[PDB]
């Protein structure tokens, strides 16, 4: 159908899955990954492949799925075997990066980031509330500032 | 006849194709308050979407 | 001596839709006619003419 949101009230800030390159930053390419890897989410590393967060024991959070500016137009999705095939999964593991947050979450600066660990659409979403279902403490990462609607720029103190 | 007098322009670009696809680029981001020698935490970037009419 | 005759037709619509792929549909039919004539000349000298009923 027509273009969504003809006129927006404010200019939306950084979309999720984006890394600021003024600060020190590292986005590292993983060749093997999971089809349908949502961008702008925390992604885990399992069996030598970058895949979506899902209920597990203690997933190895490898960082934030980088949003490709020159990727396919559509939902933020990493795809294999299509016209929109993405050869590698670009993952932001160091620096300031934008991640979607649970719509219930209301975080603030220097709050410890919690990723979502569920087999649902909310997989890989950040949050401040640790009592949220499937709240996984991401090691050494803090919310920095609210960029967009339900998107927060967080800071990964060390590599993820 | 009232349509074309309303003001809607007629766009003869679609060629012979069975559908016309239009694409929209939106600038997303924001300038952030900075000091003399700091690292900017505000980034201006692009996003897009598309539509198709048969 | 017997004669073989074959047709090929198109339309401006599909002519231009084929030109979309930089394909000259009339020229392509002419090449196909010549190639099928060559193939039939090759086959008639090897297997003769099979009637359409077998």
């Amino acid at each position: 159908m027509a273009f969504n949101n003809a006129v927006l009230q404010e200019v939306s800030d950084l979309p999720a899955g984006e890394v600021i390159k003024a600060s020190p930053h590292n986005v590292s390419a993983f060749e093997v990954f999971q089809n349908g890897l949502i961008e702008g989410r925390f992604v885990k590393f399992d069996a030598g492949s970058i895949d979506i967060l899902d209920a597990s024991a203690t997933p190895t959070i490898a960082g934030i799925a980088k949003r490709k500016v020159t990727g396919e137009i559509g939902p933020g999705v990493y795809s294999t075997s299509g016209i929109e095939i993405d050869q590698v999964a670009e993952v932001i593991n160091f620096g300031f990066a934008t991640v979607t947050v649970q719509d219930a979450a209301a975080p603030s600066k220097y709050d410890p980031v919690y990723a979502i660990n569920l087999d649902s659409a909310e997989a890989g979403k950040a949050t401040e509330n640790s009592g949220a279902t499937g709240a996984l403490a991401v090691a050494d990462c803090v919310f920095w500032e609210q960029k967009a609607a339900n998107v927060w720029l967080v800071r990964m103190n060390k590599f993820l | 006849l009232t349509f074309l007098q309303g003001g809607i322009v007629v766009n003869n670009e679609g060629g012979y194709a069975t559908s016309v696809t239009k694409l929209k680029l939106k600038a997303e981001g924001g300038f952030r308050e900075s000091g003399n020698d700091t690292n900017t935490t505000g980034k201006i970037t692009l996003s897009g979407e598309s539509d198709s009419i048969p | 001596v017997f004669t073989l005759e074959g047709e090929s037709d198109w339309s401006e619509i599909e002519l231009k839709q084929a030109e979309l792929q930089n394909v000259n549909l009339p020229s392509r039919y002419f090449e196909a006619h010549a190639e099928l004539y060559n193939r039939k000349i090759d086959e008639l000298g090897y297997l003769g003419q099979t009637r359409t009923d077998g």
């Binding site: 396919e72 137009i73 016209i83 | - | -």
Partner: peptide
């Protein structure tokens, strides 16, 4: 969200056209 490049532009349909070949 997603990207800026429409999917069909991320594919280069080769200008070379390969005709079908038959026995000699």
């Amino acid at each position: 969200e997603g990207g800026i490049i429409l999917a069909r532009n991320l594919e280069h349909v080769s200008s070379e056209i390969f005709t079908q070949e038959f026995a000699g």
